[PDB]
Structure formats: C-alpha cells, structure tokens
Nucleic acid binder design. Structure first.
Lengths: 76, 329, 75, 424, 305, 332
DNA sequence: GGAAGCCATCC
DNA sequence: GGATGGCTTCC
C-alpha cells in the first residue's frame, strides 16, 4: 500500500521474491545494493532471516523505491 | 575341502496369493460366490504431530504451520455395511526333496551335504518341523492385523490329490495360542501328511480358507505397495483384478515363525527362521555372529569341521535349508 | 542440508533407505508452508542434479503464475 | 629448441608421477634409477615404441575383438553420384586414431604433445637442427629419431583379413561377384559424436533450453534428438580400439531408423457412444500433432503463398493418408464385428468403415451395407475435418482460402473415391 | 533398368530375432541390401529351375517388435542381450552387443521370364513358397505355417496384362490386400534440393542428412520445423577404400576364387509411404546394381515418380 | 588340413513358446485359452548375505538392519480359477546336415563331404533321432515348471500341408529324465526325424504341453539381460520375457533343452545327459567337461576323423555329428 | 630346442 | 582386455 499507516515491512521470505539469484526478477544482492547506493554487507543485513540474529527491517521509502527500480510496481 | 563359491537353494512350501471376500457369518458354508472387497479412495487432512528441531519452536512459526495444513488422498478397504465376516483363501504347495542344492561347484561339498542331511533324516523325521508348520497353519498367523481383536476365527483346511477333496479339517484358531506348541490328534495327522510330503514320498497340494468375524463395515488390511514420488496419491494397496490381496511372501513369512531356540530369551516367543535371525519390527538381530549361533558358522561347523550341534539347532539349520536362498561368496 | 532457490526450499528426509541395493533419500520441495512435490533420489548426487530434478516444476509454476496475474489490456 | 626442453620437463613430471607411487622398502633407489635412465635416453627408449605404432582411419577390431586384419588409413574420393555421405565430405578437420601398445600410446601422445606448441606436428619429418638442439639428442640420434618417426607415420601393414569379418558378395551387372569386406569408420563417428555432444551439451544448448522454457526469443537455434540407441564397445576397457574409444568411453549413439507406428497399442474399436463420437473425431497422437500443426498454419500470410500452399497441400494429403491408414488398421486390427451397444452414429459409419458382416452381424444388414457404400460417412468425415480446421471470413474473403477449400474438396473427393471403390 | 512383366507377392512373413542394428549408425529396420541378397539367393536356389530372372523387392512392414528396454533414468534406450555359453575356463564370455527384433513383411517380387508360358502361376507360386519356407532374412528364421493358413496362397499378376484401366483395376484389387503397412523408397532428390537450400548458408554435406531427420524447434519471431513425409535414414550401400584384389592376394578369405574389396558403408535417406499414394506398383522394386570402375555398390528404387 | 574359415548353419529351428492357462479336462478345447500376463509387485527383505566377517560388529549390524531394503520385481501367476498351464511352440527341421556355409579350402570341404557321406551310409540317424524324440517325449523344455508337478501331457502333431499329417500324445512323467528306452510311437517320431535330417525337406511340427500345477500358483518364463553400469537410481531387479503382452520362453532356452543328449562325457555318468558343445561346458556347474587336454573334445576328434583319418568309436561319432548339427563358426 | 603355455604387466 | 614378452619350462 501507499498509505504509511497500514504498511508493514516485509519478512525475509517475501523479500526473497524479488532479490537473489533464485528470485523471479533474477537480480543479485550486489546489484540491488548498488541500485540503492549501499554496501553489499549492509544489504545482506536486511536478508538474514530473523531480527534477533542481527537483522533490520527495511524502510518505507527504500522498499517502494526498490520496487520502482526493478520494474515491479510503478510507484508514482 | 572348503565351501563352494556358488550355492543356490529353491524353496519348498510355495504359497499362492491370498485374496479376500466378504459375507455374513453362519453362511460360511455357502461361501463360494461371495463378492470380493474392493479398494477405494478418500481424502484426509494431515496435522502436525512430529517432534521439532528446536529451531522451529517459535510460537509464530508453529501457529503459521497450524494455519495451513496439507491434504492427501489415501486408499482404503472396508467390509460392506451389511456383511460382518472376512474370508481369505489361498493355496499351499509342499514340495519335498530339500537336501539338494539347485546350483553348486564342488562335488565333494554337495556329497558331504547330502550325507549330512540324509543322516539328519535317519535320526529324526520331519515331525518336529511339520508339527510346528501345522501349528502355524492351525492358528491364523497369516491374518496379520486382521486377527487382532477379532471376535471368533475359524479355518478350514482341505487336501487336494486329484481335482477333488481327499480329507478336511477345521479348527478354532483362538483356542490355539500364538505362544506355545501343544498336541492334538487332528493336528498331528495333518503334520504327518506334511511330513510325508516333505520327504518326497508323494506330493501334497492344499488350499486353505479362513473366516474372521469382525463387524459391520469395519476396516480390513490388505498388503501395501511402494511409492517413489508424488505430485496427489500418498498410499496405495495391492490388488489382483480388482480384489484386495496379500503378498505371497507375507504368507510365507507368517508361516516360518517357528524359531524358539534363539539364545537371548524365551518370553518374546517364536520368530521367523533367518540367517542372523532378525526382526524388522524391533530393528535388532538375534543370533549374532559374535555368539557362535548364526546359520553360516553352524553350517560349516557341521559340514567342514564335522561338529553336529544340538538337535534343535539342527532343526534351525534344516529350516534355513527349507526356506532356501543364496549362499556362497 | 537444505537448498534454497528463491522462495523455494528443498530438504532431505533425515533417514534414507535402500532401493535396488543402492542408498537413497526422500526430498521435498516447499513453497513457504505449502508442500508441492516429493521425489526419491539416490545419494552420490550433487546439488545441481537435485536442482534440475525440480527445475521443470518451478518453471511450470512460474508460467501459471505469470498467466493468472497478468494485467488488463486496453485498446 | 623449447619443445625438447618441454619434453624433458614432461619426462621429469612423469618420473615424479612414477615417484608418487613410492614404496617405503626400495622405491626410492628404483625411482632415482628410472628417472636417470629417462632423462638420459627418453628418445632412445621411445624410438622402439614409435616403431610399433600406426595411424589409421578404418579399424577391424570393432567388428569383433578377437579378429585381426588389415587396418587402413585412406580418404577415398568423392563419388560421381551426387548427394551421398562418406569420409570424402570433410578433409580439413580429420582426427586419426591409432592402434597399438599402451606404453606406445603414451609415447605417441608425448610425440603429439611435442608436435604442438611449435609446428612440430607437421614438421616432425622436416627438422634436424632445432629439434636435436632442443631434445638433447645428437645428430645420429636425431637421424634415427627422424627415421623412426617416418616409420611410425607410415602404415607398415600386410594386406590380409580375418575369418570373423563380414566379407560379403555383391553381384556385377550380368556377370559374377566381388568380395566386399567392410571396415568400421572411426574418425567419422568421432566427428559426429563431437557434433552430437555439442548438440546435446553446450552453453548455447542450455541457453536455448531455458529460452524455450521462458519463450524469450533472441536470435538463436535449438536442436533436439529423440530416441537414440547406445552401443558399448568390448568389455570394461574401451581403449583397445584406439584412444578415440578411450575418450568416447566405448560408447556410440545410434540414430533412429524406424517404421512409423512402432508402438503397437491396443485399439479402442469397441462400441462406446462417446467412444464413437470421439472416433468420428479420431483423436490420436500423430493425428493430434497434425491437427495442432494445421491449426497453427491457419494464421499465415500470402507473401509465401506458393510455399505455404505447397505445405498446406502436403499437410492435408498427409492427414488424409493417415486417416485412411488408421481406418484400415482399425478395420484389419478388428478380429470380429460386434453389435455395439449404443454406438451413436458408430453403426452408421461402420456400415462401410467397419468390418465385413460376420456371424455377429446380420446377413441382411451385410447385404444392405453392400448395397450402399458409405458416401454419407465420407460426408460426415469431411464435416468433422472442416470443423477441426479453424476457418474464418479471411479465407472466405481471400482467394487463397478459396484455393485451400478447393484443395480440401479435391482431397475429400479422392478419399470418397478410394472409399467407394473398396466399398460395396 | 528393366520393366518387370509379372508381379509375385509373398503375403505375410513372420520373422523372429532378425538383426536390428544392420549399420554402424542406425538401429531400426534392416538394410534393403539384405532384401536384394535374399531375392538373389532365391534366384540362385530354385528360380533357375523354371526360367525366370528376378529383379526387385517390395516391402510393406506390417508390424515391428524389438527387444529394447529403457534404463529408468534417461531418455536413451539400451539393448537386450543373450547369454553365450561358457568359455573353457568357465569364467565368462566376451560381451558383444547385438539387436534382435521381430518383423512382419510382405515381399513383392517382379518377374521377366516365361511366367505363365512354361507353367501356370499357381504352381510356381506354390513351389516358390515351399522354397522360401527354409531360409533366413537378416539372421532371422521364418516361423512356419501356423493358424494363419488363410494367407497361405500367393498370386502372380501380369504387369502390363489387360488394358490400361484393367491394369489399373488389377493394381487397385492388389493394393486392397496390403492394407496395414508402408512401402520404403529412396528419396535422394529431396536431399538434393534441401542441400541446395542450405548451400546458401554454407557448403556442408552430411549436415543436410543430419538436420533433416531431427526435431528442430525454432525460435519465435516456440515452433517446430516440419518435413512432410516419414523421412528415415537408410544405408545406401558401399564405397570401396582399396582397389580390386586378386582371389589369392588376400589371406583368410571366404572363397579363394573371387576378387576382393575393402569398403566403407554409404548412407542415404528413405521414406515410408502409404500404398495408396503410388500409381504403378513397378515404382517400388529394389534393384542391386554395380559400378566396378569405382567403389559404387548401390541398391535403389529407380523409376519411382 | 582344415581351412581357416568354417561355419555351419543351424538345423532344428524352434519358435518362441507362448504360455496360456485354463482348467483341466478342457485341454482339447484349448484353442482360445487366455494368456498369462506379467505384473509388478514390491518386495521388502532383510540382509541374509554372508557378510565380510571382519565387519560383523553388532552395533553396525543393527545399524544396517534398520535401513530397509525395497525392490520392484516381476511376477506371473495363474488365475485363481484355472489350474493348468499350456505351452505351445513350433519346430522346423531342414536336412542336409553335412554341408557348411563357408570353407576357405575345397580339399577339406570335399574330404568332410565324403566322410559324412560314409557316416550316413554306415548307419542312420536312429540313435540321435530316438534321443531327440526322448527329449521331446519328456518335457525338458518346461524347465522349472515341470518340477513338483502333478500330471504332464504332451501333444505332437505332424504338419505336411496346411492340415495335420499325424498326431501323437504321451505321458511325459512316465518317461524319465535319465535313460533312453524305445517305443513304437517314439520310433515312428524318430523315423520322421531321420527322414527330415536326410535332406528330404522341411518337416514341420507343432508341440503343445500341459501340466497340473494348482490354482493361482506361479510360472517361470525367461528373464532378460540388463547391464547396470550407471550412477542413476536402482532399476527393477527382475524382468520377464513377454511377446505381445503374453509370457514366453526364449527360443535358445528350449533349443538348449532339446540337445541334452550326451551321456559319453568321460568324467562320470551319474550326473546325467548334458548338452553338446565343443569341449562341453555346462553353465550350472561352471565347469567344462571333455577337456581339450584329453582327446575327447570336438576339435581333436574331428581332426583325427577327417584329416589324420583316425576314426574314433561310434559314441564320439555321435558326439561330433551332434556338434555338426548344432551349428557354429570355426576357424583360427 | 622351439612353442606353447602361463603369467604378467602395460596401457 | 588386447598385445608382447621373458624368464622359465614343460616335453
């Protein structure tokens, strides 16, 4: 959703739908990290698997901008 | 003088496949046109019941697994809703002439074998083995799970010389236990018939039927099958021209449970006669080769180094010869 | 050891068996909490072989998901 | 120059590999003596091995391992009758395989590896100074090595065959015979085995495979071979043909050469009403493939209308011939004519398209079926065929669709004439 | 070469464990050279005792049944073998791979001699039947007469007998007998024009035979390229490697009285056609002809279209 | 001497014996009896092999027990109502026993021609034909199905033209597997065999056998030759021979059952008649009788008979002419 | 002596 | 698993 009040961050399993070599877009973690202007390590911080095991949620803006740049949602 | 490279043995006591039919009690003497029971399908909802690997023990993951159960379809077999008696019929064939191997290399080896088994025949007949075989036919061991919790089970045994009946029997298979070997006049008469067959003194062909009183529309248990992959079906049964059936090797394994001479204990009861006599139900081997009581060491101690063991161990070795298999290197 | 292909996971079944004299193992292909296929594969298989054992089912699922959720067309 | 130093380094590496299998009792002194003898006289030891080996393109041992005859290295001329297949088609990319002793094969592989790098593979005959300067062999040793290499490059065989070859006859025009012994080609099957491996395996092959899984169409081809057969040469060790059989692992893939219907399946001839309705359609595997091809060929244009019309006429004729053959196979495959319970329109079609009036059929019904041939069955079959072919107003409005309708009418008339000639 | 005047048909032959491979590249039906050799041996055995020469063979291949199995893990297919008896040591044998198959073929033969003149056609058909019931075809013995005693009798038919429409209707009454089968002819001209098409790409020769008998799947502009008939590879014959050798110049020969050649197999293209797509039955007879100036050893079916 | 190339073609070509089943006392109506099919079923066994005995080690034995062992096999049974098995095959005899198909030198050819002319002019085929009619009289071709039977019955039919020439029937269990007696019907059959072997033409027979076994018991057709040689999953451990979806026996198995005639192997006589082979080697014992170290193998006996003209006794003559009628490819 | 035979080792 | 031999290795 575009409304910030109802949005929740995705989990790792949902996030593997678009990032990773097995995903449907077929884009790497390194290329997606370069698409957001981050390091590879800080991007790997997002896809650890559980927030207790050193994992952070992604932001609203980074998530929607990443969906924009991959050609999934238009996100005007 | 050593053991041969190859050694093959055919099997005596060849059974048929046993198929099932259903009908009413007290009409069991008219049971020649009873319709067969059939295999259908139904769908079952699986649920989570296994142990967990201490990583799948978050409550959220557990409830998320509870939310989406998997579905399966599964074969089943029941009695009809009005009949209450299960009829199982098969055919046993006793061969005789059990000493000779069907394949061999060293002639002196098989000659030593032949005189060993001839001396065993001369000392004792087959009366102990035939008595125990007729015991395993008296109670219905071949009714594997269908015997469990049955109301009353009766069995007719019928001798076939030409195309007609020679002599019959009948029993109450619940009166005969599963544990011990008793004595009975009809039973030893049948055992004498089997012993006459096993000595090669005339061929014996038997057909056995068995009736089990269970209940209306209850579940019966045919033999199962093997599934390598699925994408759908997860359990299949065995059938011959659309009639539920039991494998022949299941009947043969239910017939050879006569071994009461394993060194471990006696409270367990008789087991089947195997080299390194084992049970898959317990995952454990009696007659370990560390003890000097498995089949192979007993065999080449009787033949090559000429130690006749105890007489019941000679019964065990002769039963392993009757079952037959692949020996050698 | 599991294998992860995107949102899919392929796990073995923790105790093998002997089929035709050779040791084997059961494998399961998951899509989240939903189990999709089960095969029985022998050992001495590298992970690439276990991958392209299931690659066709993956591709068919992709084809169906692409056709079902296609967007609307104006003209 | 550098090639002989590389050969000496390869001999030292072979001595180190022979020292890798070292024994703790006495392996060290024997390995040192063998390495000293190798580094001294590798060429002198290899001349006697290179005298034993011969290069060959046709071999007799694949016919049977126990036979022995003349093995020939020869490229025959291209025949005059055009459009054929032989060894003459390629000359530039040949690879000859050699028969001989295994240590001799190691020596020949060392000679071929020394033949690489420089131009030594073609200059093993014409080279004295640089070769003797690099290899450490003298002038007399270089001359003896050149003589041994010229001898090993030669055939060196006597013309004779064995008793386990084929050596068949072929009659001459109006006169006697010749004896014709066939030899197994090995360079040709090594070449086409490389091409078949490249067809079945390769980055372009797997890329076109995942392309045809994703239907992304970049400019590329995709080849596929169905139902090969596999043959095994000899026992467990394959190199006894040659080293080409060592690298092919004693395997040769065979191409299918089969009659059309080589899977004799049971016929669903029996009297089902829905079975008769589906048999009026006649959905089979080859019939379904032909119907799919005909439906795919409907949306074509008229720019290739000559070739498109030829392909459409060939497809229609093949469909008509397959329908007639399937009807004949269903008729002759039928043992007897049974009265079908509820065969809806199946009796009306099988008055002619069914078997003769047997004892299960009535004699009056058989005489009535002999009185009138199944022309209406042909009309119903033409209607089912025209319903199977997707038509539209573009064919009715276009002249090419009118020509296709005329061709289909001519094919239906030929089928009705062939049915009426046998009918009655 | 020559036009046969009488056509004689062998109705339905039941053969077991004939050779399946018959070539170093194919493994389906056996070679037509075996059919030319069979009719030549039929001429040499008995056909000289009734003053006929025989020219060409016709085959229809009613059924095919080979002993082949698939090894449960791949798309290829493996052969069945037989157990050779023991070596004198008693260990094992040298394993050689062979292909057995069962066939069902009708044999169509042409004639040129005084067919109906010296004797009627029925008795010469019966005697050539009793001659043919004792041989083998490609290593496969003929199974004898069984409860198929109904296709026992044969019939000779004169080629140009009667009028042209009478010849046509006799041809139609004859092809009403060979219903479930397919004849096999050479189709080299299709290979010529196809090679001429791909010569615009590049000048390769065996690729024309290789690419015309696969399933090429084309990229979308996900489709398949089609060939209109049942194009099947076939061994065309032989090309020699060596010149002619003298009857004693080579050792261990079969007979030391006939000159010898060392040959390589030649391959071609065939096609399985329906019997009702041909006009004349004289278009499907396999003649063995030789060119001893070169290595050309050819069987074919001239005068087809 | 003998030539470098020597080959004989096979006489007595049999057919693939198809199997069918039905009930007793209807065997005269057995022209339409249904076939016997092959099915599959699944088996689970345990370990019963002799293990390496340096890895007995009871913990690892209980470990190797608890992983189960599953296979898929083939099976062929009679139906639950029928109790009789019917086997049928044909047999073509050719004649012209002496002539080879290949000879490199004509001197050994016409020397062999004249010495087999002498052998056929000395005595007839009546010994060999009597033994062949014995091997068809008892049903040796029912390899394992004969074992433990109840009543066996053979029917032999002479076929000249498309009708029956003459019929025969026997009780195959009365004729033993042991010796070679004589019988008027058997000697008439031996007369037919000796006439057919004499180059007189193609003599054609159709043989049908019957056996009371029982209801729903198993029969034994041939097996196949499959080589594993593969990384892939295990195949089914047993496959049977079928011809057009009906169980069958191989032609070479019944052909090997026919030539079990040689009682003159020099080692003993209590083991019984064997098949005829050059240095005759059985596969059941894995051992080659008539060793070439002795002069009772086929090659040395022939080279004494025709080349050095040292004629052995009549038994070795029967042996070498049986190896001639078996066929084969000889040479260096 | 010479051949043949076996075994052996190579690849 | 075919090929060549080398010291034995008979007779």
């Amino acid at each position: 959703t575009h409304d910030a009040e109802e949005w929740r961050p995705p989990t790792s399993w949902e996030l593997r739908h678009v990032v990773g070599e097995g995903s449907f877009t077929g884009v790497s973690g390194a290329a997606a990290a370069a698409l957001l202007g981050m390091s590879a390590t800080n991007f790997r911080k997002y896809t650890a698997g559980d927030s207790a095991a050193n994992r952070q949620k992604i932001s609203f803006a980074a998530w929607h901008y990443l969906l924009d740049r991959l050609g999934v949602k238009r996100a005007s | 003088l050593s053991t041969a490279s190859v050694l093959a043995f055919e099997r005596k006591l060849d059974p048929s496949d046993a198929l099932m039919s259903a009908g009413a009690w007290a009409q069991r003497d008219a049971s020649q046109e009873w319709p067969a029971v059939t295999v259908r399908e139904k769908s079952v909802r699986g649920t989570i019941s296994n142990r967990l690997k201490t990583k799948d023990r978050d409550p959220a993951k557990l409830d998320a697994s509870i939310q989406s159960p998997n579905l399966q379809t599964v074969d089943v077999a029941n009695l009809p809703s009005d009949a209450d008696t299960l009829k199982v019929r098969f055919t046993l064939r006793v061969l005789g002439g059990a000493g000779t191997p069907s394949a061999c290399n060293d002639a002196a080896y098989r000659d030593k074998l032949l005189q060993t088994v001839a001396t065993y025949v001369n000392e004792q007949g087959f009366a102990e083995l035939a008595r125990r075989y007729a015991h395993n036919l008296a109670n219905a061991r071949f009714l594997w799970r269908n015997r469990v919790g049955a109301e009353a089970v009766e069995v007719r045994i019928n001798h076939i010389r030409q195309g007609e009946v020679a002599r019959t029997w009948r029993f109450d298979a619940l009166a005969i236990g599963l544990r011990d070997f008793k004595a009975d006049a009809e039973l030893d008469a049948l055992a004498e018939l089997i012993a006459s067959g096993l000595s090669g003194s005339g061929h014996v062909l038997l057909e056995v039927v068995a009736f089990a009183r269970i209940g209306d529309g209850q579940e019966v248990f045919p033999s199962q099958e093997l599934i390598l992959d699925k994408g759908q079906k997860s359990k299949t049964l065995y059938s011959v021209r659309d009639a539920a059936a039991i494998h022949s090797q299941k009947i043969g394994n239910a017939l050879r449970t006569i071994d009461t001479w394993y060194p471990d204990e006696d409270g367990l009861g008789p087991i089947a006669v195997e080299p390194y006599g084992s049970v898959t139900s317990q995952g454990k081997a009696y007659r370990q080769p560390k003890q000097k009581l498995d089949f192979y060491t007993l065999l080449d101690n009787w033949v090559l180094r000429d130690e006749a063991p105890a007489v019941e161990q000679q019964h065990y070795v002769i039963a392993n010869l009757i079952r037959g298999g692949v020996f050698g290197e | 050891n599991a294998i992860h292909i995107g949102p899919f996971s392929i796990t073995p079944a923790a105790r093998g068996l002997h089929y035709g004299g050779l040791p084997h193992h059961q494998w399961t292909l998951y899509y989240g909490p939903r189990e999709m296929a089960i095969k029985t594969l022998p050992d001495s298989y590298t992970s690439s072989e276990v991958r392209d054992e299931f690659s066709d089912i993956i591709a068919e699922f992709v084809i169906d998901a692409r056709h079902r959720y296609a967007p609307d067309v104006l003209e | 120059q550098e090639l002989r130093q590389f050969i000496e380094s390869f001999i030292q590496e072979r001595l180190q590999g022979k020292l890798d299998k070292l024994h703790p009792d006495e392996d060290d002194k024997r390995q040192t003596l063998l390495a000293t003898h190798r580094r001294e006289a590798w060429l002198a030891d290899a001349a006697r091995r290179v005298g034993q080996l011969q290069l060959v393109t046709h071999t007799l041992k694949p016919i049977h391992p126990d036979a022995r005859g003349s093995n020939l290295h020869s490229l025959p001329q291209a025949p005059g009758q055009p459009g054929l297949a032989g060894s003459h088609e390629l000359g530039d990319r040949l690879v000859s395989d050699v028969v001989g002793n295994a240590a001799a094969l190691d020596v020949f592989k060392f000679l071929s590896l020394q033949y690489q790098g420089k131009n030594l593979l073609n200059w093993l005959t014409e080279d004295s100074a640089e070769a003797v300067q690099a290899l450490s062999d003298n002038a007399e040793q270089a001359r003896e090595w050149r003589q041994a290499f010229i001898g090993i490059t030669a055939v060196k065989g006597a013309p004779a065959s064995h008793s386990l070859a084929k050596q068949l006859y072929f009659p001459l025009p109006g006169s006697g015979y010749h004896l014709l012994a066939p030899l197994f080609p090995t360079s040709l099957v090594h070449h086409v085995h490389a091409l078949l491996r490249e067809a079945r395996f390769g980055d372009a092959a797997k890329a076109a495979r995942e392309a045809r899984s994703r239907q992304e169409s970049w400019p590329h081809g995709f080849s596929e071979y169905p139902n090969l057969a596999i043959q095994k040469f000899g026992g467990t060790k394959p190199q006894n043909i040659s080293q080409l059989n060592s690298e092919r692992y004693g395997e040769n893939w065979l191409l299918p050469s089969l009659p059309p219907h080589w899977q004799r399946q049971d016929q669903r001839a029996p009297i089902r009403h829905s079975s008769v309705f589906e048999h009026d359609f006649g959905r089979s595997p080859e019939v379904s493939r032909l119907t799919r091809t005909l439906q795919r060929l409907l949306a074509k244009t008229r720019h290739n209308n000559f070739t498109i019309r030829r392909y459409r006429a060939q497809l229609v004729g093949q469909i008509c011939d397959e329908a007639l053959q399937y009807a004949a196979r269903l008729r002759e495959l039928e043992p007897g004519w049974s009265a079908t319970p509820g065969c809806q329109l199946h009796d009306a079609e099988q008055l002619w398209l069914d078997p003769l009036r047997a004892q299960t059929d009535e004699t009056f019904l058989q005489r009535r079926l002999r009185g009138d041939w199944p022309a209406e069955v042909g009309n119903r079959f033409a209607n089912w065929l025209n319903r199977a072919v997707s038509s539209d107003s573009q064919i009715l409005g276009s002249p090419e669709a009118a020509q296709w309708s005329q061709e289909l009418s001519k094919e239906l008339t030929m089928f009705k004439e062939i049915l009426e000639d046998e009918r009655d | 070469v020559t036009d046969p005047e009488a056509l004689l048909l062998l109705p339905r032959l039941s053969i077991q464990n004939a050779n399946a491979i018959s070539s170093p590249l194919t493994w389906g039906f056996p070679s037509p050279g075996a059919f030319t050799g069979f009719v030549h041996a039929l001429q040499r055995r008995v056909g000289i005792s009734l003053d006929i020469e025989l020219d060409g063979v016709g085959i229809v291949c009613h059924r095919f049944e080979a002993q082949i199995s698939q090894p449960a893990g791949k798309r290829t297919k493996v052969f069945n073998l037989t157990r050779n008896p023991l070596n004198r040591d008693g260990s094992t044998a040298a394993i050689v791979e062979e292909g057995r198959a069962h066939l069902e073929v009708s044999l169509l033969l042409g004639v040129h001699g005084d067919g109906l003149d010296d004797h009627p056609a029925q008795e010469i058909a019966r005697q050539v039947q009793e001659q043919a019931g004792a041989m083998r075809l490609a290593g496969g013995s003929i199974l004898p007469w069984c409860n198929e005693r109904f296709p026992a009798p044969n019939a000779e038919l004169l080629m140009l007998g009667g009028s042209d429409e009478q010849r046509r209707k006799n041809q139609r009454r004859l092809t009403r007998r060979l219903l479930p089968g397919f004849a096999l002819v050479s189709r080299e001209a299709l290979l010529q024009q196809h090679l001429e098409t791909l010569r615009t790409t590049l000048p390769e020769a065996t690729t024309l035979d290789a690419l015309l008998d696969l399933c090429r799947i084309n990229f979308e502009p996900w489709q398949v390229r089609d060939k209109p008939g049942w194009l099947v590879p076939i061994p065309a014959g032989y090309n020699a490697l060596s010149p002619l050798y003298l009857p004693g110049e080579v050792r261990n020969a079969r007979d030391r009285e006939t000159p010898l050649r060392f040959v390589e197999n030649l391959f071609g293209l065939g096609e399985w056609l329906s019997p009702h797509r041909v006009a004349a039955l004289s278009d499907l007879l396999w003649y063995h002809h030789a060119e001893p100036d070169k290595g050309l050893y050819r069987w074919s079916t001239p005068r087809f279209v």
